[PDB]
């Protein structure tokens, strides 16, 4: 009905707006973002720092289904910026762990960020909205090219800091538990198999 | 009671009223040192204010209390004060009969 306590005022810039709590609060407190793609791309470019990159991705991977086709094109365009075809696609490396004989390489929080982007895309374009890739080829090619830009099918070079010593971080697991966290991440699996099977109509009937 | 944080809840009051009968001989004229959270330092500063009595600590105006706990610095003063506030009426009752 009414406030239980007083609310101290703030001006227009410093309010916490841009998000919304889930429909049923007292049971589920999940936070869903309402932010437009323009200001998320803006947050991605204007504050180049790692945490704002992750912060942009966590919002635009929450909202994938809730935007149109071209709105996705500007997204993948904005996201494909720090990637060179020649260079290793996904390697973001922070800590050198010299603990063992041969130095270990640990990535930062950007890696699972991009991967979570790809998996959200997987849930949107394959499972709950299978028609969308077939409808517009534009984002078919955009998604395919972004998916080729980070190299999703050789994750081993996500973890490789020196190309003379290729790192097997992705392809290796031992039963005592090494690489449970870096283990086999089906990443581009469902997407690529699906968008191959969109082109798999070999039938002359249609 | 003793270890309560912040505000003193009513349940906590119930505790004190329970321990009223725990000790058979008690009068509102009893010395300060029987109170919860009255230490050495807390007793002394009450004494120089000419307060010997549970009645007298129940007679405080609450702006004597705060400068007892802030300007002077007997801490946990509102605990003992409130402890008086609760217990002075029942004591009078038990004193009559």
């Amino acid at each position: 009905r009414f406030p239980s306590q007083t609310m101290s005022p703030c001006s227009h810039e410093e309010e916490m707006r841009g998000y919304v709590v889930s429909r049923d609060y007292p049971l589920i407190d999940r936070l869903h973002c309402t932010r437009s793609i323009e200001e998320l791309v803006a947050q991605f470019e204007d504050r180049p720092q790692i945490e704002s990159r992750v912060a942009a991705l966590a919002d635009m991977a929450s909202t994938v289904s809730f935007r149109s086709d071209e709105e996705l094109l500007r997204m993948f365009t904005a996201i494909s910026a720090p990637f060179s075809v020649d260079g290793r696609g996904l390697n973001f490396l922070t800590v050198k762990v010299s603990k063992f004989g041969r130095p270990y390489y640990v990535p930062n929080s950007l890696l699972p960020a991009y991967v979570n982007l790809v998996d959200a895309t997987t849930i949107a374009l394959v499972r709950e909205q299978p028609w969308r890739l077939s409808a517009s080829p534009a984002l078919f090619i955009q998604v395919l090219q972004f998916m080729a830009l980070i190299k999703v099918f050789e994750p081993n070079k996500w973890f490789t800091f020196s190309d003379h010593a290729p790192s097997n971080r992705a392809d290796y697991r031992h039963a005592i538990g090494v690489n449970h966290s870096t283990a086999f991440w089906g990443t581009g699996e469902e997407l690529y198999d699906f968008m191959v099977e969109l082109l798999r109509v070999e039938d002359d009937g249609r | 009671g003793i270890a309560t944080g912040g505000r003193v809840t009513n349940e906590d009051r119930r505790w004190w009223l329970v321990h009223l009968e725990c000790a058979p001989d008690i009068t509102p004229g009893t010395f300060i040192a029987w109170l919860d959270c009255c230490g050495t330092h807390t007793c002394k500063k009450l004494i120089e204010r000419n307060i010997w009595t549970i009645e007298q600590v129940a007679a405080l105006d609450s702006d004597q209390v705060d400068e007892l706990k802030y300007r002077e610095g007997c801490l946990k003063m509102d605990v003992v004060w409130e402890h008086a506030r609760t217990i002075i009426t029942p004591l009078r009752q038990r004193e009559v009969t």
Binding site: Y19, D29, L31, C33, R47, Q49, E51, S52, A55 | -
Partner: protein, 76 residues
């Protein structure tokens, strides 16, 4: 080679500078006591290059300070 000097790690995360954020320094200071000295509001564990403020981090009961862009001299 260019020289082997390290650039500033003073603003990064450090696990032994991390413990002093929530530690109680009342006796260390005679005149100048500050609310929480090592604690940088909005930044992960006192580190200035780790800025989280005015991002989407959902923290229902704790405060967050708004974003003002950090200067050049504060980082390095």
């Amino acid at each position: 080679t260019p020289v082997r000097d390290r650039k500033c790690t003073l603003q990064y995360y450090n696990p032994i500078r991390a413990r002093f954020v929530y530690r109680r320094d009342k006796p260390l200071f005679d005149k100048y006591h500050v609310t929480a000295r090592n604690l940088a509001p909005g930044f992960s564990r006192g580190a200035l290059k780790h800025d989280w403020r005015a991002l989407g981090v959902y923290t229902p009961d704790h405060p967050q300070v708004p974003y003002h862009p950090l200067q050049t001299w504060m980082l390095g």
